[PDB]
Amino acid sequence: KRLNETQRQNQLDEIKNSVGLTFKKKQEVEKSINDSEKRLKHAMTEST
């Protein structure tokens, strides 16, 4: 019981670490999304 509980807890906080990792990667790709939108805007101006 203690063995399975410890493996459960290790799986738990490893999942929590990976969740923090992917949330940081999303929070860092947001800025390049907005900058790419800005250059699409300027591309539309020169298109017109």
Partner: protein
């Protein structure tokens, strides 16, 4: 080598007997307390 050099071939008579040593620290160990059942209590991720 020495000039002191005691010289008597005879069995020395016994003086003291061997008893339990009268110490009470450190033939013993150091106690540890631990259980995984403290790892049950976690936080509810609520804000984001």
């Amino acid at each position: 080598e020495n000039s002191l050099s005691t010289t008597s071939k005879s069995k020395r008579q016994v003086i003291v007997p061997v008893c339990m040593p009268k110490i009470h620290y450190s033939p013993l160990k150091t106690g540890l307390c631990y259980d995984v059942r403290m790892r049950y209590h976690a936080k509810i991720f609520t804000s984001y």
